[PDB]
Amino acid sequence: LNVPRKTRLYVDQTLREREAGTAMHRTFQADLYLLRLRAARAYVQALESSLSPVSREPLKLHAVVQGLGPTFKLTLHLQNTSTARPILGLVVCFLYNEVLYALPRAFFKVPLLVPGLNYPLETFVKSLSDKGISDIIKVLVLREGQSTPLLSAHINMPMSEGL
């Protein structure tokens, strides 16, 4: 068989574990407690800013960028993830730096999202800076009666390769 081999490192490590197992157990439990703390912290901060592209109220969105050159094709793949329930009133709003990117329609309604179909909703981003400047673009999907985004996404726009 291909049963692996173990060197001096393994027996020294097992000897350390056999002689100092209690301290390892205690410190790993402390580290796990601190990790749960920090993960809950970051999860709550994300819920606050609503920066999760995956978040009752079922949705899933991710934005793909395609193309070099001053004009990029930005396609948002959006999807309703539910057994059988459509989502009527939703709308997408883009947040960009109006001095670097020229978005024609930075806000538009989305079609009735049928559960199970990936809707590609695309736009044409265009770099305006004569010098190569890469700035982030935010996308917020939100209801039409609410003001807090249902979910969000980020895209680091690549360099322009302009003229």
Partner: protein, 475 residues
């Protein structure tokens, strides 16, 4: 104290701002002084200098629109164009992930311009692919025929034009006039003309100059330059013979052994790349490249303690990264050292200068958590990996696995579809989607997914049983 002396001493100590500044003064004070002139030129060209050997982007045009390999379909084992994808993560259909990203890594090549465009910009290079790979002195004002007569000025001026301004044509003009002034007897001008050619596109016209420079005086530089030229013409076995010739000249050079190992890993026969990286280690023992590569290989072939040693070595040598500490965390956890595991991930999250590095650290923390149990912590870590890098397919796949563990089948289906859309070269999202589909039915989707799984990891086992069952249901 004195201007020229203090500026030159700033240059010796690699300040590169103070020297240019005192020279700018010294040039405003006197319009006729060439010492400070070329000193400021040196400072300017060395603030930005990067050696041409390890700059091999190759762009997107030179990957398809440029054909230079003689043989179109050469024997498998003589062209550039281990652990299975069930253990080692992958980047393309094959090509398992490597240690020590270098800016010369090609790591596979696209087939068509459309595929190369419609993929992530950094899926074939360490940097996003391009389309093709006041002012101190205005290049259109000086007569290169007069600076060529003075080699002391000509050498620094060529280095300035080539590495600061990136004007290959004027650089080549200057280098040609200089070489004809030296009656073709100095290997340096030959090497520089060869570099001008090599980044103009003319490989054979560059190999000529590199060979003629090797005839003058053997240097590691010219050997590595010819190695680049030969690799560009898709000739590994010529580069290996040339490297062994160089090692016959320089008996224990580390760069030559490392180039041999890089070529052996591009050809993907690790059983010799490990031997040559071990030779590099026997020579250097601080080499980040060989240490990282042997460490990764030791980790993935179920020997995480030896990899932990190899990475603790880099920790001992002052290396302080986000990658190194996440690696130390993975090794410590999988080598069963639970005391130094999570503090390494914390240092990693601290050191991460990106949003993809943070996402990878959170992904690995979710792996630690799911190895501990407590699937909720891993759920949060995968969701945070998604929050930090939206195009993180492994996080999608693992979060869908945990969702289907909970019971939410539609969430898992959508997440696996997203994963398989982001990374088609991976096999796990396709296999899982096919599995869940077959569990509920929809044998058409199961077939369309299991066939893509077999396209991604063609030597899988469960994919074969799935395909057999499906093709049996179809009759």
């Amino acid at each position: 104290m004195e201007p020229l002396l203090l500026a030159w001493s700033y240059f010796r100590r690699r300040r590169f701002q103070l020297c240019a500044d005192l020279c700018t003064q010294m040039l405003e004070k006197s319009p006729c002084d060439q010492a400070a002139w070329i000193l400021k030129a040196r400072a300017l060209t060395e603030m930005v200098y990067v050696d041409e050997i390890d700059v091999d982007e190759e762009g997107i045009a030179e990957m398809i629109l440029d054909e230079n390999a003689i043989a179109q379909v050469p024997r498998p084992g003589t062209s550039l164009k281990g652990p299975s994808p069930a253990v080692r993560p992958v980047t393309q259909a094959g090509r398992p992930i490597t240690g020590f990203l270098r800016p010369s890594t090609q790591s596979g090549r696209p087939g068509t311009i459309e595929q190369a465009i419609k993929t992530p910009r950094t899926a074939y290079t360490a940097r996003p692919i391009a389309s093709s790979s006041g002012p101190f002195i205005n290049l259109s004002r000086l007569n290169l025929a007069k600076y060529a007569q003075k080699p002391k000025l000509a050498k620094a001026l060529f280095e300035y034009i080539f590495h600061h301004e990136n004007d290959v044509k004027t650089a080549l003009d200057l280098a040609a006039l200089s070489t004809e002034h030296s009656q073709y007897k100095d290997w340096w001008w030959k090497v520089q003309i060869g570099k001008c050619y090599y980044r103009l596109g003319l490989y054979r016209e560059a190999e000529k100059q590199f060979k003629s420079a090797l005839k003058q005086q053997e240097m590691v530089d010219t050997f590595l330059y010819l190695a680049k030229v030969y690799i560009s013409l898709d000739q590994p076995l010529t580069a290996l013979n040339l490297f062994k010739q160089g090692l016959d000249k320089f008996p224990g050079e580390v760069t030559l052994l490392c180039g041999i190992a890089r070529i052996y890993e591009e050809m993907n026969n690790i059983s010799s790349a490990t031997e040559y990286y071990k030779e590099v280690l026997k020579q250097d023992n601080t080499h980040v490249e060989a240490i990282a590569c042997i460490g990764s290989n030791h980790f993935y072939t179920d020997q995480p303690e030896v990899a932990l040693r190899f990475y603790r070595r880099l920790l001992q040598m002052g290396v302080y990264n986000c990658q190194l500490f996440n690696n130390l965390g993975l090794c410590c956890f999988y080598a069963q050292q639970y005391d130094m595991t999570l503090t390494s991930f914390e240092r990693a999250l601290s050191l991460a200068e990106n949003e993809e590095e943070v996402a990878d650290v959170w992904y690995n923390l979710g792996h630690v958590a799911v190895g501990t149990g407590d699937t909720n912590l891993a759920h949060q870590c995968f969701r945070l990996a998604l929050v930090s890098n939206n195009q993180h397919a492994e996080a999608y796949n693992n979060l869908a696995v945990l969702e289907m563990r909970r019971g939410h089948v539609e969430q898992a289906k959508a997440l696996l579809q997203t994963a398989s859309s982001l990374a088609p070269h991976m096999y796990e999202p396709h296999f899982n989607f096919a599995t869940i589909s077959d569990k509920i039915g929809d044998l058409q989707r199961s077939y369309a997914a299991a066939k893509k799984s077999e396209a991604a990891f063609p030597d899988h086992v469960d994919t074969q049983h799935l395909i057999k069952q499906l093709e049996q249901h179809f009759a």
